[PDB]
Design a protein around this nucleic acid. Structure first.
Ligand SMILES: [Mg+2]
Ligand SMILES: [Mg+2]
Lengths: 103, 121, 159, 43, 49, 51, 177
RNA sequence: GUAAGUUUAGAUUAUAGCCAAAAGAGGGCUCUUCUGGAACGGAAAAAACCUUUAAUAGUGAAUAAUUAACAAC
């Protein structure tokens, strides 16, 4: 219990100095979540599409217009309406076809 | 009119407590100064600009070795406020021809003649 | 009630809580035991990928085997020639890490790299702002570059 | 040189194994709760 | 480099946090110690020459 | 490319004479939203094998 | 570690739901905490271009507290845009009309003055009292410590605690009291 | 302590300053004398105050100045 940080969340910390005093050794094994700290999976009722569809239920006038649709989308994702509007063709043609990819 | 200033001599007469505070003996005075520029001569009068170039302190935070003799001290008093004066100290003695290439000036003001870059052990 | 006793109040005690450090004697025994355990892990080879923090050129690089580093200057090494990185500040594994003060000993860590490419940077435009700026008062800076592939990070039981 | 195009390089360092101990996610450094009870949950 | 360890080596970064807090506590004790107390285990400086 | 990874896992643990894993909900965030995060840990003999 | 590409990315940039209790709390201290989580400044992966903010739920905003005489001295000003449309309201008056307004306005000023501030305010959920919609409760991940430790009232103090504190002075027998 | 100076040969441009701080004289201006300044940092925006020896490439580091300050027997 020499560590100054609790060992119960991320990892156990053991700090030690080598006898010479020129190295600092840290032993940090990970902590596993105890079984008693977990919940059973809710087996009774799933693809993320199904969850999306229920949130964006088509109720009024069959397909909604841009205005009503955008307000429905904004509430579901906690965004503003402005994000969902399109852009003109100057901006669309500026977008790179093949952006660089890192790993 | 802004003009060159003459400091009263009492400023440079130390007190017994000063020797204890700075740890310098009034006898056996140190021989060489370590002087670094720590302020800019911009916005300072031209006479202060001149001495800084005479003393070699054009670059800031780069130490210059100077003689602890009255004539040099007179110039240093002109720019006292723009510099830090530190006594050069020789724990292991003056560098010789053999050790001239192995010296190092420490921040403490000590010129060591053997610099190894190894743990003291 | 002892002398200089103040009843508990809002300002009687400092906001912070004083902590009691373990006595040095017991800690040193535990310190040696901790070091011994880690040394066995190194000795028995109970580790996977290693990552090291290395001081090369003027910069520090978090490094792991198969990694690529770009150095913004010429190095004087032929392409394909293997090198040892000698200033390691940290070597780490899944379960342990070793910290230098400030540098780890050569006995512990050996980091090897290879020169893969010697190149130049793309043209960088250096144009200052001045009266009558003009379009031709322009400088192009191209700097030699070196690319190093980290090959191995190895540790030995010499704690 | 290699034939790779001489253009701006975004990062001076490339690695396919950036992490050994696990990449940080918001639950790392969060302690679990008995029975996995979320705050204000009665049980 | 400290950012790279925080994002990609969380277990190592926790060790650094414990080491930093460990040294910080020693400094608090040292100031109250007045110099009579011996120096902390992690507060020792490896000299070079 | 392996489909039904749970079925494979079950077979492997049987070969090791290990008990069938029990799935449980370790960490949970924003379940009722459209962007939920779930951590599920497979527990064998009340011991965590994978999350 | 050892996750597939997409699940790892999803976990790292997932957004968390935090709970703040505002009872007997200064709005500014609540604002500092909330403004930190809303921006995502609590994450090592924070970037201004990453939209890594979190959801903050603040309850009991009706029961916030001000130091000093800020209830009567702090004034909120608005203009409708028409001649004579300038309004100045004290903190108490604004609190009476809307219990939630004071907390929202303190947080609004603390967020960066850019377009993303409007998006961040969508993730802020302010409830005047302890009651929360069931769905918001289920999202919650963690509660945050109250920034201000609330002093105890006399009645709250236990009988044992009272005895622990010394009786500094003694009233004389011949006193009305 | 330091590296400039004098002389010979040739040559234009310039010959309306601005602001800050000192000392005067006319009486806030208006003059004369002496010092400093012309950020890419700071003082909110900020020619003139303060920090700043030139010019560079780097996903390094130590720093400078740094608009804030804590009612009565
Ligand atoms: Mg010009
Ligand atoms: Mg400031």
């Amino acid at each position: 219990t020499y560590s100054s940080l609790p060992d119960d969340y991320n990892c156990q910390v053991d700090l030690a100095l080598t006898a010479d005093g020129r190295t600092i050794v840290c032993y940090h094994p990970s902590v596993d979540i105890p079984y008693e700290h977990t919940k059973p999976i809710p087996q009774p009722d799933e693809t993320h599409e199904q969850i999306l569809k229920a949130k964006l239920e088509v109720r009024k006038s069959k397909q909604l217009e841009q205005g009503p649709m955008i307000e429905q989308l904004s509430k579901v994702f906690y965004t503003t309406k402005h994000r969902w509007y399109p852009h003109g063709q100057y901006h669309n043609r500026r977008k790179k076809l093949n952006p660089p990819r890192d790993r | 009119k802004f003009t060159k200033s003459r400091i009263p001599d009492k400023v440079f007469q130390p007190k017994p407590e000063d020797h204890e505070k700075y740890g310098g003996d009034p006898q056996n005075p140190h021989k060489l100064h370590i002087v670094t520029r720590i302020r800019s001569t911009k916005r300072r009068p031209y006479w202060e600009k001149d001495t800084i170039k005479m003393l070699g302190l054009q670059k800031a935070h780069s130490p210059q070795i100077h003689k602890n003799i009255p004539s040099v001290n007179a110039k240093l008093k002109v720019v006292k406020h723009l510099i830090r004066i530190q006594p050069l100290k020789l724990p292991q003695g003056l560098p010789t021809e053999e050790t001239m290439s192995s010296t190092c000036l420490k921040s403490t003001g000590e010129l060591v003649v053997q610099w190894h870059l190894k743990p003291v052990e | 009630y002892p002398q200089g006793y103040v009843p508990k109040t809002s300002l009687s005690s400092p906001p912070w809580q004083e902590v009691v450090l373990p006595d040095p004697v017991e800690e040193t025994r535990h310190h040696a035991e901790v070091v011994k355990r880690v040394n066995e892990l190194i000795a028995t080879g109970q580790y996977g990928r290693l990552f090291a923090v290395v001081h090369f050129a003027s910069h520090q690089w978090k490094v792991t085997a198969e990694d690529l580093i770009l150095i913004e200057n010429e190095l004087d090494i032929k392409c394909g020639e293997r090198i040892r990185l000698e200033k390691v500040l940290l070597v780490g594994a899944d379960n342990f890490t070793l910290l230098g003060k400030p540098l780890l000993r050569k006995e512990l860590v050996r980091v090897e790299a290879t020169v893969i490419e010697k190149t130049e940077s793309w043209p960088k435009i250096n144009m200052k702002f001045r009266k009558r700026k003009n379009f031709r008062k322009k400088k192009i800076i191209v700097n030699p570059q070196t690319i190093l592939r980290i090959n191995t990070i190895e540790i030995a039981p010499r704690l | 040189q290699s034939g790779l195009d001489v253009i701006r390089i975004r990062k001076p360092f490339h690695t396919d194994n950036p992490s050994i101990q696990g990449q940080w996610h918001p639950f790392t450094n969060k302690r679990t709760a008995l029975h996995g009870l979320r705050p204000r949950e009665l049980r | 480099v400290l950012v790279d360890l925080a994002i990609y080596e969380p277990k190592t970064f926790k060790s650094l946090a414990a080491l930093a807090k460990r040294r910080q506590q020693e400094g608090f004790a040292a100031a109250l110690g007045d110099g009579k107390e011996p120096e902390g285990i992690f507060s020792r400086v490896v000299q070079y020459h | 490319t392996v489909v039904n990874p749970m079925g494979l896992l079950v077979e492997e643990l049987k070969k090791r004479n290990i008990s069938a894993p029990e799935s449980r909900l370790t960490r949970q965030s924003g379940s009722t939203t459209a962007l939920p995060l779930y951590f599920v840990g497979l527990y064998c003999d009340r011991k965590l094998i994978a999350e | 570690s050892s996750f597939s590409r997409a699940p790892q990315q999803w976990a790292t940039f997932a957004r968390m739901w935090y709970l703040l209790d505002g009872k007997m709390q200064p709005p500014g201290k609540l604002a500092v905490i909330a403004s930190n989580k809303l921006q995502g400044l609590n994450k090592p992966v924070y970037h201004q271009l990453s939209d890594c903010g979190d959801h903050v739920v603040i309850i009991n905003t009706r029961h916030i507290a001000f130091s000093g005489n800020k209830w009567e001295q702090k004034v909120y000003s608005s203009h409708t845009g028409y001649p004579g449309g300038f309004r100045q309201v004290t903190a108490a008056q604004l609190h009476r009309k809307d219990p939630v307004a004071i907390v929202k306005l303190a947080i609004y000023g603390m967020l960066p003055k850019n377009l993303h501030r409007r998006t961040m305010m969508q993730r802020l959920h302010l409830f005047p009292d302890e009651d929360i919609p069931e769905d918001i409760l289920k999202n919650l991940v963690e509660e945050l410590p109250q920034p201000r430790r609330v002093p105890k009232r006399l009645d709250e103090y236990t009988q044992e605690e009272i005895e622990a504190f010394p009786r500094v002075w003694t009233p004389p027998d011949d006193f009305r009291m």
